C-alpha cells in the first residue's frame, strides 16, 4: 500500500551515466516498480535475470532494490553474469554468486561514442588482489609492483592503474559502448518496500 511510481527514469534515462570503476548506485525504496515500462524504451538486447523470472515480474514484491549503473565494452557484457573471470569482473565490478537481480545492457554507441575516441570512460587494469563482491575502487594510486619502490612517474616497470576506453564509431559490435544497469534484490526476511501493480 504505497501507490507511487519508482524513479526508473533516473537510472535508465540519465544524461551522464557512470564510469566503469566508479559505477553509480541509486537505491530505490517505498515505490511501485512496473518493469513492463522497460519494454517500451530503447531495445534492450540483453535482459538476463538470474533467479528473478523477468516475464511476469510485476507480481513480485521486493524489500531493498539496489540499482547500479555503468558503461562497458561489448564483449565484456558477458562478464556481468554472477561468477566469471576476465578483467572487469575481477578488478572493476564483480557480482556474488547469489545475485538475485536483473542485468539490462543496451548498446549506447549512438550517444557514447565520438570521433577519435570518447576518453570519458576509465576502467581499472592493474590491481593487487581480485575485487570482492560489491566493492567500488574509487582510489587511483600508482600501482607499484612489489619489487622496487616507485614514485609519481611512469617508466618500464612502473605504470598507472586506470586506462581509457576508446569508443570510436568505426568499431564493430563488441568494442562499442554498452550501458549496463544491474538491479540487486535482497528479498530477505523484512517488511517489503517495493512492490508491483496489483
Amino acid at each position, epitope marked *: 500500500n504505497i501507490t507511487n511510481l519508482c524513479p526508473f527514469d533516473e537510472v535508465f534515462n540519465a*544524461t*551522464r551515466f557512470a564510469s566503469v570503476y566508479a559505477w553509480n548506485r541509486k537505491r530505490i525504496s517505498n515505490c511501485v516498480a512496473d518493469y513492463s515500462v522497460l519494454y517500451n524504451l530503447a531495445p534492450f538486447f540483453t535482459f538476463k535475470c538470474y533467479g528473478v523470472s523477468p516475464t511476469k515480474l510485476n507480481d513480485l514484491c521486493f524489500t531493498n532494490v539496489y540499482a547500479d549503473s555503468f558503461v562497458i565494452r561489448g564483449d565484456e557484457v558477458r562478464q556481468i553474469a554472477p561468477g566469471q573471470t576476465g578483467n572487469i569482473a575481477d578488478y572493476n565490478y564483480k557480482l556474488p554468486d547469489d545475485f538475485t537481480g536483473c542485468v539490462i545492457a543496451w548498446n549506447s*554507441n*549512438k*550517444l*557514447d*561514442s*565520438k*570521433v*577519435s575516441g570518447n576518453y*570519458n570512460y576509465l576502467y581499472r587494469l592493474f590491481r593487487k588482489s581480485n575485487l570482492k563482491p560489491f566493492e567500488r575502487d574509487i582510489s587511483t594510486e600508482i600501482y607499484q609492483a612489489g619489487n622496487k619502490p616507485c614514485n609519481g612517474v611512469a617508466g618500464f616497470n612502473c605504470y598507472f592503474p586506470l586506462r581509457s576506453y576508446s569508443f*570510436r*564509431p*568505426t*568499431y*564493430g*559490435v563488441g568494442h562499442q559502448p554498452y550501458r549496463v544497469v544491474v538491479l540487486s534484490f535482497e528479498l530477505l526476511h523484512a517488511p517489503a518496500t517495493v512492490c508491483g501493480p496489483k
Partner: antibody
Framework: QVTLRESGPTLVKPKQTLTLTCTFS??????????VGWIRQPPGKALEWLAL???????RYSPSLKSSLTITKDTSKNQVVLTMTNMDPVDTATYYC????????????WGQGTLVTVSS | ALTQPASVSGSPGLSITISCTAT?????????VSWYQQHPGQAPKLMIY???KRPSGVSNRFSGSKSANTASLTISGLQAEDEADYYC?????????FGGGTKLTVLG
C-alpha cells in the same frame, strides 16, 4: 525548428584569421550526443569536414589541419565560434555549420553557408 | 576516403543506385553512413541516414543498402525535381569523410 545561421566577414585578407560564427536556435547544445561542426565546400568541389564540438567541451579537428582550427562554444548566448589562422588563397569556399544530433545521424540539419573568399 | 561515380544518368521513373565504395579501408566496420542531397544553389539536405532508417520528411523513394562494405543509395521513381548532387559520408578512425560527388541527369 532547428535553425543554424552563419555570420562573420566574407572577405578576408590573405594570411589572417577568420571569425566565422554560427548561431543555433531550436535545441540545447547540452544534450548528450549532440554537437555542432563545420564543413568546407570549395566552388565546384566536394565537402570536407573541418572541426567539431560536443556536449562536453570536446573539440575534434581534421587530422590534416590542427595548427589553425580552433572551435569554441558560448552556450550562454547560443553561438559557436570558429577561428582558423594562416588564410591561404585556396580556402575560398562556402562554409556550413551543421548539427550532429547523434553518432548515427551525421550532421542532419545544415545551415545556409557563407562564401568566404581570400583575395588580395 | 570514399569514391562515388561522377556522372549518373536516369530515365524518368526508372530506379538507379549510387555506389559508395570505401577504398583504403580505414573506415572500420562501416556501420554509420548518411546520404545528403544538394541542389545547385542550396545547402546539403540529409536524404537518408544509416542504411536502414529514414528521416521525417523524405518519401519512400530513397532507400539504403550495404552489401559487404559498399553503401548504396537506391532512388526509384525519378522526377524532374531530383537532379542534384548526392554525397555519402561516414566516419573514419580520425575524421569524418564526406566522399565525392554524384550528378544525376534525368533526360527528357
Amino acid at each position: 525548428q532547428v535553425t543554424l545561421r552563419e555570420s562573420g566577414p566574407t572577405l578576408v585578407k590573405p594570411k589572417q584569421t577568420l571569425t566565422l560564427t554560427c548561431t543555433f536556435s531550436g535545441f540545447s547544445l547540452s544534450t548528450p550526443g549532440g554537437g555542432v561542426g563545420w564543413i568546407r565546400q570549395p566552388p565546384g568541389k566536394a565537402l570536407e569536414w573541418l572541426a567539431l564540438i560536443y556536449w562536453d567541451d570536446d573539440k575534434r579537428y581534421s587530422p590534416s589541419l590542427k595548427s589553425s582550427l580552433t572551435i569554441t562554444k558560448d552556450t550562454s548566448k547560443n553561438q559557436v565560434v570558429l577561428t582558423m589562422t594562416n588564410m591561404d588563397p585556396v580556402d575560398t569556399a562556402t562554409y556550413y555549420c551543421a548539427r550532429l544530433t547523434a553518432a548515427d545521424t551525421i550532421f542532419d540539419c545544415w545551415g545556409q553557408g557563407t562564401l568566404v573568399t581570400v583575395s588580395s | 576516403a570514399l569514391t562515388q561515380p561522377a556522372s549518373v544518368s536516369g530515365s524518368p521513373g526508372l530506379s538507379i543506385t549510387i555506389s559508395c565504395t570505401a577504398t583504403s579501408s580505414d573506415v572500420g566496420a562501416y556501420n554509420y553512413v548518411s546520404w545528403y542531397q544538394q541542389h545547385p544553389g542550396q545547402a546539403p539536405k540529409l536524404m537518408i541516414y544509416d542504411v536502414s532508417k529514414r528521416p521525417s520528411g523524405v518519401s519512400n523513394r530513397f532507400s539504403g543498402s550495404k552489401s559487404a562494405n559498399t553503401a548504396s543509395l537506391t532512388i526509384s521513381g525519378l522526377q524532374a525535381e531530383d537532379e542534384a548532387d548526392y554525397y555519402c559520408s561516414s566516419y573514419t578512425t580520425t575524421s569524418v569523410v564526406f566522399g565525392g560527388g554524384t550528378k544525376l541527369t534525368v533526360l527528357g
